[PDB]
Structures are given as C-alpha cells and as structure tokens.
Amino acid sequence: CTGIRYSDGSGNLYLARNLDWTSDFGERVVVTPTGYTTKSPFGAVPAIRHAVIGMGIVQEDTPLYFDCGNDAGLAVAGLNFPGYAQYATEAVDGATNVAAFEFPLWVASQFASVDEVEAALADVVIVDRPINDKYPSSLLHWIIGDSKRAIVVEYTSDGLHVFDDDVDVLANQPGFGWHHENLRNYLNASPDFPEKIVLNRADLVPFGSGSLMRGIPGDYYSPSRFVRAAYVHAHYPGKSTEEENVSRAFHTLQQVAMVDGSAAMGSGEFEKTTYTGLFSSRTMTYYWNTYEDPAVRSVAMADHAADGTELVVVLEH
Amino acid sequence: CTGIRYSDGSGNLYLARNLDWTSDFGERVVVTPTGYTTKSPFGAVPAIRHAVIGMGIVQEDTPLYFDCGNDAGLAVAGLNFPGYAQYATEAVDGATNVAAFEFPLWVASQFASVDEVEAALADVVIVDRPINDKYPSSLLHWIIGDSKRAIVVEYTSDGLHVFDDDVDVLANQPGFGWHHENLRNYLNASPDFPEKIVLNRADLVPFGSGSLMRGIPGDYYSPSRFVRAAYVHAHYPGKSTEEENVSRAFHTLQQVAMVDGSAAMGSGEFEKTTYTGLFSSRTMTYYWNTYEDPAVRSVAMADHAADGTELVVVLE
Ligand SMILES: [Mg+2]
Ligand SMILES: [Mg+2]
Ligand SMILES: [Mg+2]
Ligand SMILES: [Mg+2]
C-alpha cells in the first residue's frame, strides 16, 4: 500500500491510495449515513456526525473501511503495517478506546478537520477487538488528511504515535520516523535538466530527462515506495480542476504500483496493486480503478441516502 | 518512450509502447489499407501488401506512424533517439532507400515476419527526406516484433545496425548494445522473497515484498527505464487471454511511465507519457489510453475496409 494527500489550493481535499495484496480483496464502496445506528465496542463512535464514503466491507452490520472520506472534507486510509502495529489488548478507563477495525470510521464519522482529530487522539487507545472470528484485527497504520495537512497515526508496542506528515505520503513498514529520516538519503534527486557537467575533462550531457533523478529506487520494497512516492508527489505541479486532480492521483500512484511477477511474498504469490482509490471532497466522490481495468469508476455521495439509516453497499457506479 | 514485445504462447503478438513527450502530440489511429496508393519518395513502398493500423498522423496523404502493426502479425514502434540517430543525407543508387518518416510504414506494409524484414534490411538505407517543411525527420530507432521475436533497428553515424532484442524491450538513448551490456549491472535483482538472511549475527527479515528487487532504478533516465522495463517485462507471467494480455501491456508500461513534474527537459517543461498504445494481432486491434484518461480505448481493423483505397483517420 501507498497513500497520498494533496489539495488544489482552493480548500479541496484529495486523498488516494493503492491497495497492494496477493489476491482479490473483496472491496466494495460503502456509504455510512448519519442515521445509521452504530455498533461501537467501547462507545468511541456513538453516532455518525458526518456521512462517510469509501472502500471496505460490511461485517456484523458494521462498515470496515480500508480508506474513506466524509462530508466535511476529512479522509483516512489504513495501510498494511504488520510487524510494527501492536494494539492494546484491553480498553483503558477514561481513554477514547477505538477498536482497530473502527478507527477509520471513528476518524471520518466524528471529526471535520485534522485539528479536531489530532486533539482527540491525545486520549486515544486503539484496542485489538476483532469484529468477529473470521476477521482478526488488521495490522495497520493510518494517514489522515484534510485540505490543509496530513498526519500519520501508528500504534505500536510503546503506544500511540502521531506524526506531522510533511511529505503527504505513506507506505508500509517500518515506522514513519524511520522513513522520514530515510528521505535525507536522497538529497541529490531532482527533476532539473542540468547545465553541462565537466567531470575532470569529460563533457557530460544528459541522455535526456531524468539525469538528476538518479538514485530514486524503483523496487517494490516499502521504504523504496515511500521515497519514490515522496519524490513524485512533492514535484507534481498543483492543479485547480477536478479532472486534473483525479488524473494526478492515479498517475502518482501508478508510479508506486505493483504489477504481476515483480515481487513475491513468502507464499510465492506476487503482490499486486489490486485497486487504487481516491476520495475528493470537492465533488464528495470516491473514484477508483482496479488491476483488471484502469478505467476510473466513481460513486458520488449525493447519489445515495447519506441521511438514511442503513449502511449502503453500493452496486451501481 | 519505452516499448515491449511479447506473445501468448499461441502465436499471437503484442507490441506496446509509451510515447513520452512534453506536450500534446496530436496522435490519431490511422488505418492504411491494401488499396491505398502510396507516396514513397524512393519507391521503397510501391504498394501496401499488408493492411496497417497504429498511432500516427497524416501529412500529404501519407501515414506517418509512431507505432503500428499489420494484418500478418508484424508490428513496429519508433522511439525517440536524438543525438544517436543519424540518417543518410541522400538516397543511395541501388539500395532500398526508405525515408525516415516511412520506415514503420515500410516495415508493416511490406513484410509478414521478422525473418522477412531482417533479410530485407541488408540493403536498406534510411534517408533524411522530410515529409514536408513543417515536419523534419524525427530522430528515432525502432523495435520490430512478431509472435516469435523482436529486433531493434538503429541507424547511426555507423550506418544500419540490427540487434537481437532478447529482452524484448526498448527505450531511448544510448544504443542498444550499451543497454544490453548495462543489464549485467543488475544480476542480483529478483522478485524472490527471502525468509531470513543472517548478516554477521543480525537476523535480517524483509519488511515485505521486493527486498531482492533493490537496485532496480526508479528514475526517468532512458538507461534506467530500459533496465526497469527489462526486469518487469521478463518477470511478468505469460497470459493466454486477450484481456489479461491487454492488461499486461498497460501495467508493464505504467511501471516505466513519466508523470508531471518528475523530469524536466532542457526547455523546463516536464516529459510525460502522453499516450500508451498496444497492437494485438490476435484481435487485429489497436488499444490505447492517454495521460488524461487511463480507460483503454480500441479500434478494430475489422471495423474498417482493410482493402479500401483511402487512409482512414479514426475518430470517436
Ligand atoms: Mg477487485
Ligand atoms: Mg476520553
Ligand atoms: Mg494526447
Ligand atoms: Mg509487502
């Protein structure tokens, strides 16, 4: 998984991610309306304050989101983090106890800005409370963004960590602090087309574009995708239309996507980008494509009963 | 530009490329039927022996292809090669003089296999004869493929060279022999997942997939794209359906595509993958998408008169 957050300079939020996995994820577009009766194990989600749309599944009449945004311009994506994610085993009195499966629902249904979430995170404990026996708690970390900025949330063996994500990207393991320091290993990567370079007495000119981009890794390893996404995302010029900003998400994430054959897991199956999803607050719309079809599909929250009482598993797009 | 050639193990050819440029290229899907009256400046294309379909433009009622395939399972793509391409300044008496703009037309309209074009290339001189004053000869090199194999044609200051493209990919500068030798700098790149590596006394386990793919470069530089394409293309599992082989082309080329902001040209403008096109001999169809829209569009040759008499510029 790799995720990005950006804006259009006019207060609109774009948050997008690749879902990387070895097989079909079973993902569906799920709308959570304001009238839905919540099922929050520790009361962290007592009611839906903001309607939510995103990719996930429904179990026990509960939306299990992989990524989602709400009707107030805040979005969140949960990216794989096994070996580093380690949730609390029990709720803590007086804390905001959030089941791991409901954390993105908590972010999106409760708050309207990163400022609000970050303040609420001061007392948050994320608890290993599986939705049921079929689905243990996914081991994840999260990127949360509004039109202004992004934060990263990592709950590990020594507790809750919240980071200022000043590169607006996230990948997988290891922790965000490690990736951020790792950026300092690529200080000579640049899109610039250099003036002619004389090495000793050799006149060296570029073959073409990208001569100073050398060093940006192209492998599928999580630290490499973080660096490659951080570079591409930082240098992508800002856009002011919905169409160009949708195109920016899918192009940026194709730069860090995974295709068949190039990197196996321990099972021998190849990890692939199974879907790429984007939430746009400007149009209150979730866009996506899949490994099998690059055409962009979309579901608008305005097309569904966002003030209804039941979770909507969207079939039409 | 980056191009690839592959098959499905059933005799069907797939040849696809990214076109990388700083602005809109104006490209259209052009069908050249067998009844079209040619305009070959030195007679290298006296008639259309095989109908042709691909991406290009039309000038002076002449199809100027960027890439194309024919009704016999042979395809060709011209990729940018400035600084290394150098054509003959004039036609050579007694040779097969092919104008640079018509070389892909010559390949696709005349021959039915790589064997045939390779035999014919022994007498070929490629000439800097522009189509008109508005379009100088594009400086290019070509990948040519059928279901069996690919060759690379480079016409430089040393004349015509034909290479066995045993990695089935092509990028831009420098020459193919340089890139092929450069592949030997990445011998430890592998998709394999190692369970654990002991370094001194440290137990090292991968963070996840791709730990042995480290070293594959991710930058937009032409040699880097050659290496990156060679790796991805070599390791993509062979597929037997049209749908999966179409998907293979666009996923493989998205791995070496260029997006806005990441690599500037001398002008300061950013080089981007303006379109990605694929020729499929199985369905005699040209597929493509664009920087502005990733949805795959397609034109089937069967929907047009492959034995008509006029160039067809496809719209809608
Ligand atoms: Mg799927
Ligand atoms: Mg509290
Ligand atoms: Mg275009
Ligand atoms: Mg992995």
Numbering used by the authors:
A (entry chain A): 2 to 318
B (entry chain B): 2 to 317
Q: What do the authors report?
A:
To assess conserved and divergent structure-function relationships between BSHAc and other BSHs, we crystallized the enzyme and obtained a three-dimensional structure using X-ray diffraction data. A model of BSHAc was refined at a resolution 2.0 Å. It showed the typical αββα-sandwich architecture and autoactivated N-terminal catalytic Cys (Cys2) nucleophile of the BSHs. The asymmetric unit of the BSHAc crystals contained a dimer. The protomers of this dimer are arranged in such a manner that part of the substrate binding site – the amino acid-binding region – is shaped by both protomers. In BSHAc, a 36-amino acid loop extending from α3 and terminating in α4 contains a β-sheet as well as a proposed substrate selectivity motif. The latter participates in the formation of a dimer-dependent substrate-binding site with the loop swapped between the two protomers. At a higher level, this dimer-swapped (DS) loop also contributes to the tetrameric biological assembly of BSHAc. In BSHAc, the interface between the loop-swapped dimers covers an area of ∼2100 Å2 whereas the total area of interaction between protomers in the tetramer is ∼7200 Å2.
Bile salt hydrolases (BSHs) catalyze the amino acid deconjugation reactions required to liberate free bile acids for subsequent and successive modifications and metabolism. Here, we identify and describe the BSH from a common member of the Plains bison microbiome, Arthrobacter citreus (BSHAc). Steady-state kinetic analyses demonstrated that BSHAc is a broad-spectrum hydrolase with a preference for glycine-conjugates and deoxycholic acid (DCA).
